Design a protein around this ligand. Sequence first.
Ligand SMILES: *[C@@H]1O[C@H](CO)[C@@H](O[C@@H]2O[C@H](CO)[C@@H](O[C@@H]3O[C@H](CO[C@H]4O[C@H](CO[C@H]5O[C@H](CO)[C@@H](O)[C@H](O)[C@@H]5O[C@H]5O[C@H](CO)[C@@H](O)[C@H](O)[C@@H]5O)[C@@H](O)[C@H](O[C@H]5O[C@H](CO)[C@@H](O)[C@H](O)[C@@H]5O)[C@@H]4O)[C@@H](O)[C@H](O[C@H]4O[C@H](CO)[C@@H](O)[C@H](O)[C@@H]4O)[C@@H]3O)[C@H](O)[C@H]2NC(C)=O)[C@H](O)[C@H]1NC(C)=O
Ligand SMILES: *[C@@H]1O[C@H](CO)[C@@H](O[C@@H]2O[C@H](CO)[C@@H](O[C@@H]3O[C@H](CO[C@H]4O[C@H](CO[C@H]5O[C@H](CO)[C@@H](O)[C@H](O)[C@@H]5O)[C@@H](O)[C@H](O[C@H]5O[C@H](CO)[C@@H](O)[C@H](O)[C@@H]5O)[C@@H]4O)[C@@H](O)[C@H](O[C@H]4O[C@H](CO)[C@@H](O)[C@H](O)[C@@H]4O)[C@@H]3O)[C@H](O)[C@H]2NC(C)=O)[C@H](O)[C@H]1NC(C)=O
Ligand SMILES: *[C@@H]1O[C@H](CO)[C@@H](O[C@@H]2O[C@H](CO)[C@@H](O[C@@H]3O[C@H](CO[C@H]4O[C@H](CO)[C@@H](O)[C@H](O[C@H]5O[C@H](CO)[C@@H](O)[C@H](O)[C@@H]5O)[C@@H]4O)[C@@H](O)[C@H](O[C@H]4O[C@H](CO)[C@@H](O)[C@H](O)[C@@H]4O)[C@@H]3O)[C@H](O)[C@H]2NC(C)=O)[C@H](O)[C@H]1NC(C)=O
Ligand SMILES: *[C@@H]1O[C@H](CO)[C@@H](O[C@@H]2O[C@H](CO)[C@@H](O[C@@H]3O[C@H](CO[C@H]4O[C@H](CO[C@H]5O[C@H](CO)[C@@H](O)[C@H](O)[C@@H]5O)[C@@H](O)[C@H](O)[C@@H]4O)[C@@H](O)[C@H](O[C@H]4O[C@H](CO)[C@@H](O)[C@H](O)[C@@H]4O)[C@@H]3O)[C@H](O)[C@H]2NC(C)=O)[C@H](O)[C@H]1NC(C)=O
Ligand SMILES: *[C@@H]1O[C@H](CO)[C@@H](O[C@@H]2O[C@H](CO)[C@@H](O[C@@H]3O[C@H](CO)[C@@H](O)[C@H](O)[C@@H]3O)[C@H](O)[C@H]2NC(C)=O)[C@H](O)[C@H]1NC(C)=O
Ligand SMILES: *[C@@H]1O[C@H](CO)[C@@H](O[C@@H]2O[C@H](CO)[C@@H](O)[C@H](O)[C@H]2NC(C)=O)[C@H](O)[C@H]1NC(C)=O
Ligand SMILES: *[C@@H]1O[C@H](CO)[C@@H](O[C@@H]2O[C@H](CO)[C@@H](O)[C@H](O)[C@H]2NC(C)=O)[C@H](O)[C@H]1NC(C)=O
Ligand SMILES: *[C@@H]1O[C@H](CO)[C@@H](O[C@@H]2O[C@H](CO)[C@@H](O)[C@H](O)[C@H]2NC(C)=O)[C@H](O)[C@H]1NC(C)=O
Ligand SMILES: *[C@@H]1O[C@H](CO)[C@@H](O[C@@H]2O[C@H](CO)[C@@H](O)[C@H](O)[C@H]2NC(C)=O)[C@H](O)[C@H]1NC(C)=O
Ligand SMILES: *[C@@H]1O[C@H](CO)[C@@H](O)[C@H](O)[C@H]1NC(C)=O
Ligand SMILES: *[C@@H]1O[C@H](CO)[C@@H](O)[C@H](O)[C@H]1NC(C)=O
Ligand SMILES: [Cl-]
Ligand SMILES: [Cl-]
Ligand SMILES: [Cl-]
Ligand SMILES: [Cl-]
Lengths: 620, 619
Amino acid sequence: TWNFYYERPCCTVREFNCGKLYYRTFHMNEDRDTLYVGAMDRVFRVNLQNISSSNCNRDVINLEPTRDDVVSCVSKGKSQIFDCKNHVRVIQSMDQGDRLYVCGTNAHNPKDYVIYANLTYLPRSEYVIGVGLGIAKCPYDPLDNSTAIYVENGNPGGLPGLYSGTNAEFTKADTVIFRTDLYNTSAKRLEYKFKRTLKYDSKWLDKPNFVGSFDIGEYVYFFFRETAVEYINCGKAVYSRIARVCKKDVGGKNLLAHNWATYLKARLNCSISGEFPFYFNEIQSVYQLPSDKSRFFATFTTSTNGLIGSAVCSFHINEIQAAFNGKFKEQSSSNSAWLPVLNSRVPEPRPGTCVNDTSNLPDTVLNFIRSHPLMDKAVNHEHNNPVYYKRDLVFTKLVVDKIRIDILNQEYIVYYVGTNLGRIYKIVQYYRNGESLSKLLDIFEVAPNEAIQVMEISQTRKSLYIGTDHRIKQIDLAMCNRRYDNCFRCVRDPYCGWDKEANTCRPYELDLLQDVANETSDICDSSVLKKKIVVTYGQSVHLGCFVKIPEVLKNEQVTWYHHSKDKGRYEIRYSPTKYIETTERGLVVVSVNEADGGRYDCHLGGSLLCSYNITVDAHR
Amino acid sequence: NFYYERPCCTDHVREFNCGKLYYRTFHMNEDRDTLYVGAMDRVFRVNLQNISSSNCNRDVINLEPTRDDVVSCVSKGKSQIFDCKNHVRVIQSMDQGDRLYVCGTNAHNPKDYVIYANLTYLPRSEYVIGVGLGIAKCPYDPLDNSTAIYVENGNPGGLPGLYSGTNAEFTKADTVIFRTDLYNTSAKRLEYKFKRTLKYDSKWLDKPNFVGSFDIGEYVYFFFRETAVEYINCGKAVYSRIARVCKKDVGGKNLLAHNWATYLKARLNCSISGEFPFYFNEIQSVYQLPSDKSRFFATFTTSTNGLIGSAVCSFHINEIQAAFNGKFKEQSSSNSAWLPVLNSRVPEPRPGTCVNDTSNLPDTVLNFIRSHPLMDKAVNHEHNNPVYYKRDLVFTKLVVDKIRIDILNQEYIVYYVGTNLGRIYKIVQYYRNGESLSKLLDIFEVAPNEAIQVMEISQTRKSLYIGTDHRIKQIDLAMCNRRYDNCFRCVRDPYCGWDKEANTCRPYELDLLQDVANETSDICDSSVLKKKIVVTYGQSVHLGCFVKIPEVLKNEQVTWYHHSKDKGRYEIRYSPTKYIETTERGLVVVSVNEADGGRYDCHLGGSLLCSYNITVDAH
Ligand SMILES: *[C@@H]1O[C@H](CO)[C@@H](O[C@@H]2O[C@H](CO)[C@@H](O[C@@H]3O[C@H](CO[C@H]4O[C@H](CO[C@H]5O[C@H](CO)[C@@H](O)[C@H](O)[C@@H]5O[C@H]5O[C@H](CO)[C@@H](O)[C@H](O)[C@@H]5O)[C@@H](O)[C@H](O[C@H]5O[C@H](CO)[C@@H](O)[C@H](O)[C@@H]5O)[C@@H]4O)[C@@H](O)[C@H](O[C@H]4O[C@H](CO)[C@@H](O)[C@H](O)[C@@H]4O)[C@@H]3O)[C@H](O)[C@H]2NC(C)=O)[C@H](O)[C@H]1NC(C)=O
Ligand SMILES: *[C@@H]1O[C@H](CO)[C@@H](O[C@@H]2O[C@H](CO)[C@@H](O[C@@H]3O[C@H](CO[C@H]4O[C@H](CO[C@H]5O[C@H](CO)[C@@H](O)[C@H](O)[C@@H]5O)[C@@H](O)[C@H](O[C@H]5O[C@H](CO)[C@@H](O)[C@H](O)[C@@H]5O)[C@@H]4O)[C@@H](O)[C@H](O[C@H]4O[C@H](CO)[C@@H](O)[C@H](O)[C@@H]4O)[C@@H]3O)[C@H](O)[C@H]2NC(C)=O)[C@H](O)[C@H]1NC(C)=O
Ligand SMILES: *[C@@H]1O[C@H](CO)[C@@H](O[C@@H]2O[C@H](CO)[C@@H](O[C@@H]3O[C@H](CO[C@H]4O[C@H](CO)[C@@H](O)[C@H](O[C@H]5O[C@H](CO)[C@@H](O)[C@H](O)[C@@H]5O)[C@@H]4O)[C@@H](O)[C@H](O[C@H]4O[C@H](CO)[C@@H](O)[C@H](O)[C@@H]4O)[C@@H]3O)[C@H](O)[C@H]2NC(C)=O)[C@H](O)[C@H]1NC(C)=O
Ligand SMILES: *[C@@H]1O[C@H](CO)[C@@H](O[C@@H]2O[C@H](CO)[C@@H](O[C@@H]3O[C@H](CO[C@H]4O[C@H](CO[C@H]5O[C@H](CO)[C@@H](O)[C@H](O)[C@@H]5O)[C@@H](O)[C@H](O)[C@@H]4O)[C@@H](O)[C@H](O[C@H]4O[C@H](CO)[C@@H](O)[C@H](O)[C@@H]4O)[C@@H]3O)[C@H](O)[C@H]2NC(C)=O)[C@H](O)[C@H]1NC(C)=O
Ligand SMILES: *[C@@H]1O[C@H](CO)[C@@H](O[C@@H]2O[C@H](CO)[C@@H](O[C@@H]3O[C@H](CO)[C@@H](O)[C@H](O)[C@@H]3O)[C@H](O)[C@H]2NC(C)=O)[C@H](O)[C@H]1NC(C)=O
Ligand SMILES: *[C@@H]1O[C@H](CO)[C@@H](O[C@@H]2O[C@H](CO)[C@@H](O)[C@H](O)[C@H]2NC(C)=O)[C@H](O)[C@H]1NC(C)=O
Ligand SMILES: *[C@@H]1O[C@H](CO)[C@@H](O[C@@H]2O[C@H](CO)[C@@H](O)[C@H](O)[C@H]2NC(C)=O)[C@H](O)[C@H]1NC(C)=O
Ligand SMILES: *[C@@H]1O[C@H](CO)[C@@H](O[C@@H]2O[C@H](CO)[C@@H](O)[C@H](O)[C@H]2NC(C)=O)[C@H](O)[C@H]1NC(C)=O
Ligand SMILES: *[C@@H]1O[C@H](CO)[C@@H](O[C@@H]2O[C@H](CO)[C@@H](O)[C@H](O)[C@H]2NC(C)=O)[C@H](O)[C@H]1NC(C)=O
Ligand SMILES: *[C@@H]1O[C@H](CO)[C@@H](O)[C@H](O)[C@H]1NC(C)=O
Ligand SMILES: *[C@@H]1O[C@H](CO)[C@@H](O)[C@H](O)[C@H]1NC(C)=O
Ligand SMILES: [Cl-]
Ligand SMILES: [Cl-]
Ligand SMILES: [Cl-]
Ligand SMILES: [Cl-]
């Protein structure tokens, strides 16, 4: 039994673990080398350089509910062990990181806070006006999918405020996209009233699950999936949406003063191209690169039992704005069709555009947008197809990394996509011959049968951070020297390069070998070593390049060759009595004789992978 | 010394090949032991017992288009090699089989014929009135999907007539479901005018592709896929339909006389169950057993480029009639949703029901049905899940067979499903505990990369007949000895039985072993392959039952058990240093020692597949 390469299992890599605390909220602050984690009854300040160095009892603030709040929550039929806890669901930086805004479920009684960055309470004299009640700022239910973002700049009066998407009621009958009251916190006076979507109006929102929100220029964008109201007459479906509000929105003048006057939403299109596209309807997560505010990356799943499938799509801000600039959709009555409105038949100023004072808008614009929140055009995804899609898996969360290779400034986009079963799919995207291409590079086993709940990526520490309900894992982005003991896998990873002279994989450098796009399939040929083995007569010998072949290679074509003086190099054909194929793509040679000696070559995916030289010796 | 799956099937397989003639139309006549085949410019009279015994030049009638018809077709931009040919698309039995009704595309100028059974023309004195022009009876385009059925009984006046679904114009603008003029042949008089769907009305038909038509009781049924008009406001889809007309239909009066007065259609529902069902939207073929008119069997595919799949669904006549007895659908204006009609708004007699003279119907009934052809309820498939479905396959045609082991209590349905790549999937359906189960039994290789165009099954010759554009194949239904060299797969086939004495698979008889429904999982235990191996100490040994594991068994659970003196029977767990799993569900035991001797059992699907006895020789 002979094996060339042993690729180390990944990644059941550092861990932070304080029990099953439902680690579902991340807020990274690289300026303080900290990953803030919201969990059950707790905010942790986790060290970004090495999460294992943090202490469960020191790097924490305990926010457990009062026993009075627990009893009241239990009295309403909720569970003492899980529901009637304070699950932290918002953590946002304030005052240049000196303080944190925190919101938690607080035993189905949402409560929010402002605390110091070191996780201590403000003095009583320093309590921030307008903070305490978390209703509409974060959910009651720890299983909800909500979103929030704290926005310092661009709001009315230049005042900071929280934008949120969550359920605002214990019965879950009031989902809302929300902005808090805006205070002059020094003067202790409320300046701008809160904003909310129209209650009881299924055209604005219908059972949404929120997956992200972003502060970009003059707007705040919200990402969510919801009941597809415009599909009801044809069947049952969930659609994905991006909603947009103007930061300067102050609502209408009198009885519309608390509702958005600029709220618009559009369907998100993630689909396989064709005469009849295959749509992935349910967005699960969205991410934006720190260096690129013009793009969003998102995961989508199907809704059906019979065809489980998931995809990654990206969307450009230009295509989002084209949707919001296109025709509005209209259902003039409950039993009518949904029809486009000619843009020339829309009132002015254009609904959804940021005017100086929405409270001065004509009633005809206010009335229009209240009945036309949905755009007729869907937001097209970049390129013709998803970045990546695959059957029988449920993508959940994702982050994205952008890297440039030094030798010729080649750019690669790397997706880290979590699953409901605790795996990470590592996908690389690149452009060749005018087209967008992607390759699945690796599957990480992070936590068997533990759904990925939250992900973050640090550029200062070159690490991936992954939250499940049981643990946090930290994975180095460049696992070159540890994970790759072979040129084959090394040159396919955009973080790595193969050092032929040293026979090692290293974080990429100019002189190192790399071929992410598979343009030079012989790049590792001179690095393939020939292992010389001695086999006794009649004995069977197991030849394999990997002890366990990486899962992403299991479907590649494998060809074995034997070198003889009479045949030259010829392809080995599997037979029941001589040449057996193993599930790990190995070769078993049965009853080795003199003619079976010599060189064996294993090619995988069109590249020489490993090579053996067999010498046959007597049974001694 | 292993199980070996013999390739199949490029116990016999016969071929009829006269070149690439696009053999796409079958008409089987078992009484005359003949398979009539319609092809390019030709109808063949193929021997049903042995299709290879037929001659390409003797058992054929040449129906090539005239020079003017070719010239006219070529001048319109159509290809002379393929488009401007006479592709036969309808063959039906007439006069107790003494004559055949034939319709061909005739270089985009459809023409029809009545010929003798021996494929010779009638004399001029016998030319049949109303026969000659094939418009609305079979398509212009050889690539069109059309259907037609010649109906002898139940029409007005008791006269025979052709029912068809096809395109009636060269421009393909006018798709029609049609009934020909009904003549009294003896008296040479037209008795009833033709019937057609409402011209250019996209709510009656919208770019349909027809896959079948059936004559049942007082109705003719049509199966087709079409643009989903009731879906247009939500997106772009194709839906599958069953449509129904009363054979007694004579239309309305005045400008309504030439239109159906009983035409209804309903969506066909083939889907995987769930909170969000997965629909297979595009019906490709439909089949009825000769002995059971209460059920329809059909293939469906998806519409997408990515993540494609196909399914087989069955439909019962009780669900079909429930759809046509349900509420009508209605879009009252171009700005209206599609909604059910209140039953109090439905006039009497009920639209779509068969009356003795539809031209005597009240205005309200005729106006209602002409504006409400689509029923609100979809036709639910039996069992609420497909009989079978598979990703990444494109099903085309199918035929179905019914097997009854009658001294036992079992009944089995075997589906033969062709693919666009020349394969046949053989699926068995059976009922246990009242729930429907299915198993993929086999995958025949009929013609690599040649789409299956037409299929027929003969009970008198117990044969499967398959047509592609290049060839015709005839396959014995009982391939028992040729296909299965082992008890394990033999007992799973409803046609076959394992002979314990001769140790061979034979066509099923009483006292042979069979277990299609896996009700006796140890039935083959005494018949499985059993091998004894003497290995030397430290030597490795490869154990395996199959030379190559059959494709259809690649999904089953395989478990290896070891009987040692020190540990009894226990499950072997794979490990790179001791127990190496091999590609064909085998096992390599590495560096055998004394404790590794004994019995090794391989289980597949929970049944013993083969067994090894290892004795270790000390060195
Ligand atoms: C594939 O299968 C098919 C079906 O199985 C095969 O088809 C068979 O093919 C054969 C060969 O062609 C057919 O046989 C032949 O039939 C014809 C027609 O027969 C009928 O008409 C005859 C002529 O009638 C006129 O003339 C007589 C006599 O002068 C006169 O009394 C009549 O009144 C009539 O005259 C008038 O009408 C004319 C217009 O019709 C006017 O122009 C004219 O001026 C007058 O006004 C008639 O004699 C004949 O009668 C016979 O048959 C009937 C029953 O059908 C019977 O009742 C009678 O007593 C007679 O027995 C028919 O009414 C015929 O003309 C052919 O004759 C030649 O061949 C025979 C030998 O077979 C010789 O004896 C003759 O002298 C003559 O040379 C021949 O009989 C057959 O009908 C047909 N079968 C079917 C069911 O269609 C086909 O062959 C297969 N193909 C292959 C490749 O294998
Ligand atoms: C083909 O066969 C398959 C298998 O046999 C079959 O599958 C079932 O498919 C359904 C989905 O279609 C699965 O789910 C159920 O769906 C029921 C229907 O729900 C929808 O339709 C409602 C009615 O709409 C009609 O009326 C309007 C009027 O304006 C019209 O436009 C429409 O076109 C249509 O004609 C619609 O109201 C409803 O929307 C409301 O409710 C949802 C949430 O329920 C909400 O989000 C919306 O905002 C809106 O308020 C929806 O669009 C549904 O009734 C059913 O729910 C009951 O049963 C479940 C248990 O399954 C309970 O949990 C629930 O509380 C309800 O009591 C359920 O949701 C169903 O599971 C499949 N069944 C199987 C066995 O797989 C297909 O339907 C067949 N297809 C066809 C075309 O026939
Ligand atoms: C999400 O993002 C994806 C990818 O970016 C978008 O994908 C595009 O989707 C459309 C479908 O929505 C694909 O098809 C197009 O369909 C339209 C409309 O088609 C229908 O209406 C026609 C007019 O009424 C009718 O003629 C059509 O019927 C014919 O074709 C169908 C099959 O297509 C067939 O079944 C019929 O028998 C007819 O033969 C059909 O009912 C159509 O107008 C488009 O194109 C025509 O014109 C262009 C310009 O010349 C030509 O290039 C086309 O070939 C066609 O002739 C087109 O067919 C379209 O292919 C998808 N595009 C890609 C790149 O994949 C998707 O729309 C987005 N969704 C949303 C909600 O935004
Ligand atoms: C915020 O977003 C998240 C992410 O999208 C939402 O999370 C999803 O929530 C739903 C509903 O809560 C979850 O579904 C449930 O999972 C429960 C646990 O799973 C078991 O079964 C798994 C396998 O499933 C089996 O059944 C199917 C059915 O055909 C078979 O095909 C399959 O082969 C299996 O046999 C096991 O792997 C697992 O170990 C568990 O054993 C289920 O119990 C649950 O079903 C129950 O509830 C149904 C109604 O919800 C009811 O119909 C059933 O009868 C049963 O009572 C259901 O399947 C998703 O798993 C979860 N996704 C992720 C990624 O976490 C979340 O809901 C959302 N928040 C809000 C507030 O909406
Ligand atoms: C009648 O039904 C058949 C079967 O459903 C239809 O055939 C399908 O037709 C499409 C369109 O021509 C074929 O797709 C094409 O594939 C080729 C390459 O394979 C590509 O170059 C084309 O652009 C197109 O994508 C499809 O293969 C074919 N399927 C089979 C099984 O033949 C046919 O179109 C129907 N007839 C009419 C008139 O619609
Ligand atoms: C990350 O921090 C943890 C905890 O400080 C380190 O783990 C300890 O390392 C010391 C020194 O090697 C050992 O004596 C302890 O036994 C380790 N503890 C555990 C729980 O393993 C870890 O080495 C640090 N990782 C890096 C890369 O610095
Ligand atoms: C947590 O942070 C707060 C605020 O930064 C710290 O409080 C201050 O502590 C410094 C150091 O003694 C004083 O000079 C300031 O006057 C304090 N300000 C206030 C408002 O109290 C606090 O000491 C930190 N706590 C821990 C444990 O690190
Ligand atoms: C079916 O018909 C074919 C064709 O007549 C038969 O095959 C021929 O068999 C003879 C006798 O061995 C050969 O000389 C010919 O060369 C064969 N023809 C071809 C085209 O190969 C076949 O035996 C028949 N099968 C039966 C009767 O079961
Ligand atoms: C075929 O039938 C056998 C016998 O009932 C099935 O085996 C049983 O499976 C259940 C559930 O997995 C086990 O609890 C029993 O111990 C099994 N019995 C034996 C004797 O193995 C088997 O699963 C069936 N196979 C298929 C594919 O349905
Ligand atoms: C890499 O390229 C070779 C030939 O250039 C090809 O045979 C092989 O399939 C490719 N592998 C992958 C993973 O694309
Ligand atoms: C056709 O008409 C003739 C006489 O006109 C008659 O004998 C025959 O029965 C009619 N056929 C039918 C089917 O009614
Ligand atoms: Cl939590
Ligand atoms: Cl416009
Ligand atoms: Cl076999
Ligand atoms: Cl043809």
